[PDB]
């Protein structure tokens, strides 16, 4: 599977140009609700691969992302029972939300915008927005880069 419980997961976005050391620059409130992210993800995933030529590795990799999120929803309920209660059953939701939860939130957005705009458009937005935050203020324009 793509998404993982690992601290520094091997090849998370590498195959699609970008890396986590680039997506990190974007704020946490920028990404929408997880349910809406997955609902609009599965929306394009089904109707594009069939019928092709529209077989893109973006929605193809999304199948290994949505199912791996399902592989966590089934896992979390089982962990918060089989062990103890304090810092064993209550810290299960605390592990996913929001650290592990943010990883999928940004991963979904990355692959969704890749089809909505273009892999290059996203990679360009990711580079230019990072460039915007890095710039020492005042010499930096106040108008932040947008994705449209």
């Amino acid at each position, epitope marked *: 599977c793509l998404g993982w419980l690992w601290g520094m997961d091997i090849d998370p976005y*590498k195959e699609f*140009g*970008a*890396t986590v*050391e*680039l997506l*990190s*620059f974007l704020p946490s409130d920028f990404f929408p609700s997880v349910r809406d992210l997955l609902d609009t993800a599965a929306a394009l995933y089904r109707d594009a691969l069939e019928s092709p030529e529209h077989a893109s590795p973006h929605h193809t990799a999304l199948r290994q992302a949505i199912l791996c999120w399902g592989d966590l929803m089934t896992l979390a309920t089982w962990v918060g029972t089989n062990l103890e209660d304090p810092a064993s059953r209550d810290l299960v939701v605390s592990y996913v939300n929001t650290n592990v939860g943010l990883k999928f939130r940004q991963l979904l957005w990355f692959h969704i915008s890749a089809l909505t705009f273009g892999r*290059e*458009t996203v*990679l*360009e937005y990711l*580079v*230019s927005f*990072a*460039v915007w*935050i*890095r*710039t*020492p203020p005042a*010499y*930096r*324009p106040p108008n932040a*880069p947008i994705l449209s």
Partner: antibody
Amino acid sequence: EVQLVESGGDLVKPGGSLKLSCAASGFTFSSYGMSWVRQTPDKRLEWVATISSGGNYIYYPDTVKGRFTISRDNAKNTLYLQMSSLKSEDTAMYYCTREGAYSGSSSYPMDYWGQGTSVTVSS
Amino acid sequence: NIMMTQSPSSLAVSAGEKVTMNCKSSQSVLYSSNQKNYLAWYQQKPGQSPKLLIYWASTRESGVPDRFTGSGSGTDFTLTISSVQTEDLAVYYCHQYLSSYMYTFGGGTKLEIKR
């Protein structure tokens, strides 16, 4: 193999115009931002302009803004520099450079440089 | 404008010796969010265009010999060649890429061979 080939360099009278071209090969040109860096006779390296992968974001230093225009044609795999109101202090070797940030992390500065085209601004 | 200063302007070393060249930025190039220094080192051999050596102040580019080492943080940085080869005859420049809205380069240090 990454190759950047600049052309267009010439003797131009002060106040004149010149258009530099850079033909890029051995990478997905539309995935990388490109820049121009000039090297003056004192051997100092000076950033001239940058243009994002798509041609959407353009950046200039105070020395060149309003006189130079960076552009690209992702269909011809070419980077351009339209210079106007040329002055003697614009005399330098002009390098076409590929921005590396586009490969993955922000860690990457400009990685490949071309061979350059010399521009002489003189009467 | 973050001005980059390089010292010495030039230095002569004998093959096999260790070399240290310094770079000073007018203001910090350390991110504090990334906790990464936005400093690069380029090598320019005679009759050639520059080639990227080091980025993030300490990380070597793909294909860069182990003898090249970058160190420092904030405003003070160094490039170390331990030990020198005659092939290492070049002008070494430092570059800050924090800004990107106004990229700057150091004046360069000219490495000459003692014989």
